[PDB]
Symmetry: D2
Subunit: 253 residues, 4 copies
């Protein structure tokens, strides 16, 4: 469709997972979509396959210099940005009793500082004409999970940055919305490959008939929420969390 034909997006962490599903949905609605990631050869092979409305750029999301260059190159090739999906992140475990400080520092650098830079530069790119900035978070930003303490904190920080960015945009008169999305588990090829032998997909995905307690969801399901926020039809929403956890709250009790 040509629904989003005038949209120009950047999706960070866009060569796999939810990121890649987002890239595919946006392209499928006629947007132009840059995606950034760290494995350049693979990213370029992917951009070749996705076609000329897509672009790959190498990107260290924790570097301000990389972000400046990426923003400039994307917009030179594809036009003025009006969708930014801050999806790059990493998941590392560690509980409060024994988790490693060095892992927490890494989570903050990659998950939280990336969103700061991306929103800072996204506001500059979009302030004249407007747009939508979408920050990937997690259910764990509000729902504590023992073994992901630092990750939870990194994503709670992301949701605070989201509200700060959204409020600045409103107070300054920029037609920019900033919102966060909070999924539960995401059934990616990496998750599947990390499962113990003998554990199958049906054992981990939520299903109302087969696995009501399941915690994992297909990435395309999450990507649909990104597509909604990227579209003009969501524009009244700013400074909010969109929860993508299928009523986990109250389960298990």
């Amino acid at each position: 469709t040509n629904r989003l034909q005038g949209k120009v997006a950047l999706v960070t962490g866009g060569a796999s997972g939810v990121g890649l599903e987002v890239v595919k949905l946006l392209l499928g609605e006629g947007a132009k979509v840059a995606f950034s990631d760290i494995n350049e050869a693979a990213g370029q092979q992917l951009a070749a396959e996705l076609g000329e409305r897509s672009m790959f750029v190498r990107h260290d999301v924790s570097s301000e210099a990389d972000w400046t260059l990426v923003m400039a190159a994307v917009q030179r090739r594809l036009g003025t940005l009006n969708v930014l999906v801050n999806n790059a992140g990493i998941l590392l475990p560690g509980d409060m009793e024994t988790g490693r400080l060095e892992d927490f520092s890494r989570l903050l650098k990659i998950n939280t500082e990336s969103v700061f830079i991306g929103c800072q530069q996204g506001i500059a790119a979009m302030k004249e004409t407007g747009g939508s900035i979408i920050n990937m978070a997690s259910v764990s930003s509000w729902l504590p999970i023992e073994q992901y303490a630092g990750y939870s904190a990194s994503k709670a920080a992301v949701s605070a940055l989201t509200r700060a960015a959204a409020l600045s945009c409103r107070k300054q008169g920029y037609a920019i919305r900033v919102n966060s999305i909070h999924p539960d588990g995401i059934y990616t090829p990496m998750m599947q490959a990390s499962l113990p032998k003998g554990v199958s997909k049906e054992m981990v995905l939520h299903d109302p008939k087969l696995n009501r307690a399941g915690r994992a969801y297909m990435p395309e399901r999450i990507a649909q929420l990104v597509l909604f926020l990227a579209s003009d039809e969501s524009s009244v929403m700013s400074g909010s969390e969109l929860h993508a956890d299928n009523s986990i709250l109250g389960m298990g009790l």
Copy 2:
């Protein structure tokens, strides 16, 4: 244009404001749409204009017996329900110091008991095959507004009912999502006629150039959120609040 062709919806409060725009949007996407309204003459008038895939029904939204009849009639004419939009509600003023108990009791009857009955009977209609229940709430369910204390409370209760319904559906294996939408003000012909004489729409609508502090929004902008939640693409979301307040939190300070 026939994106929602297999959807069968009931929209309460469907003849004005957000409800009216929901009926239009759903019909525009090819759904079949029944609606009711507290203003019954206004509803019958609208049905005569909207065509064969629409139907108006008389409905006391606080009556269990009338809901039973409505759910049966709608499904007899249009098929198995899979979208329910609990939008009927009333706004009455009253602060905690001087507000009237009788207004609060009426707010609870009409705003809160209606959602209880509609969700209960919506689960009965949808548990075999699935669907989406959308409860209209308000920013005021979480953001206190001095003159609308009882209304706020009625809508906070609606949000609690939303979570309980969503949880029961998950625990029972029903493919039913239940979510609430929390708008700020809704600009309508009633709002305009209500303004002091000489006040124009630009004085009450949020606008980033003209009125950054504005609290009112076009009803179609809310209806788009309802459309998303009615669509299959939003299915990972259940038990959640979608906020439609355009970053009001932090304004004014």
Copy 3:
């Protein structure tokens, strides 16, 4: 002690459970305490036991006329009220699929309308001289529990009334603080008598060693939070929820 010597309190539903523990703690710090409830002979016998600084009054908390009389009486006997504890309430079960509307209606009347009236009356009593208003709520106002859907909604409504009252007080320049307390289960003799053969206090109370998953707490523990809010030391708090659930969120997953 004499620590709360000059406090004059009214505690509704004060003849048993958390309410009775509140009464005892307040009296123990030297306050004057009126307590209201529905069984006159029992309540009077309790007042005899508690002594001269206590007063029992029979009270239909859903009636304004009855409240007007109670407030006058209490104040005629004990002096200017500066602490109001809206503790009266009822717990009735019912899930969204099969719960009875008539039960939900009763929950709203008794749990939610009572707080509305109490808050109105309390503002009237305290607007010139100042004080604290403390509204009992529940963990279930925010944590859905499938068999207490209506109760949850009633208590979510109480929390919204709390915020509205607090905001009015601030805006109007009244030195009145209004807050809510949200306990998990309350272990009382009636709870015990309602448990199946074999389920003992030790099996339902939380204990870090014996019962980590337990959901019930002694009433005095909750009553401590009421005492804090009744004291001048808590004065910075208003419009807030005090959660008394001992880190339930995240358990069971």
Copy 4:
């Protein structure tokens, strides 16, 4: 008067502000109290004046080595820890459009990594016999403030760490509560010196009668909430936010 006689506390940021007021309240109830602060000239002088139950220690709160040494030194001198107040923090301004990445990194290091280390080491100190960990946050963890974007994120992260720590303690059967406190502004010589000519205590401090719009509070009023959480009477509360903003939500609108 010796109500907290068996308590042994460590208070970071204890030479000024809320921390100092916390040290003094805990000492006044009979506890033993170690404190640290970046102003060692003022800190050591204070410990001298405060007596044998107080101790000052040098402490880089971002250093896992320093924490290990402080924890050991404090417990050698004063006995097993059972109260930890993570109060050390820095306020650096910066909005999302132009705030410095470097300042955000420093905010996370000092405000968020300190709480990580402090809670991890606090759990090790208290797991055998129990205690209370109190993390200082801010209203800004949930209420966006344009000029303090990074600070807000640092404190939202602190609240997430609070929940993770509290949940671990509950799941592992440790009698440790972990909670956060969220004040609005805190009036100190720092802010008052920061203030322009003629802008006095009375101009910025909230006063329920004379300055309803005021956002600044005396540190002792926040310290009272820490004292309550340090005390055994608060023990039902864990994993929670204690909001100390005096009904700011809804003001200004």
